[PDB]
């Protein structure tokens, strides 16, 4: 029971710089992109109804 370790994990976490990426669309264009990704594109579907951020 000591306060010596108070920022341990955040302090010892290796620092990774954020990568540069093109800006995300905002407003009506973002909603248009979401609608197109969910209702006009079917190629990602394979019959399993997997999630949009599936990793396996």
């Amino acid at each position: 029971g000591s306060l010596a370790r108070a920022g341990k994990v955040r302090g010892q976490t290796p620092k990774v710089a954020k990568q540069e990426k093109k800006k995300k669309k905002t407003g009506r264009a973002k909603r248009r992109m979401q609608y197109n990704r969910r209702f006009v594109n079917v190629v990602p579907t394979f019959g399993k109804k997997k999630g949009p951020n599936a990793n396996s």
Binding site: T45, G47, K48, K49, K50, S56
Partner: peptide
């Protein structure tokens, strides 16, 4: 990986809720 199998095995484990969600995704929707 078949989510029916994953639910059968891991339903009582730390990932029971996740395998339940994956099973429900596969069961209805296509």
């Amino acid at each position: 990986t078949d989510p029916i199998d994953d639910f059968q095995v891991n339903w009582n484990t730390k990932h029971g809720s996740g395998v339940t969600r994956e099973l429900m995704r596969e069961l209805n929707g296509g």
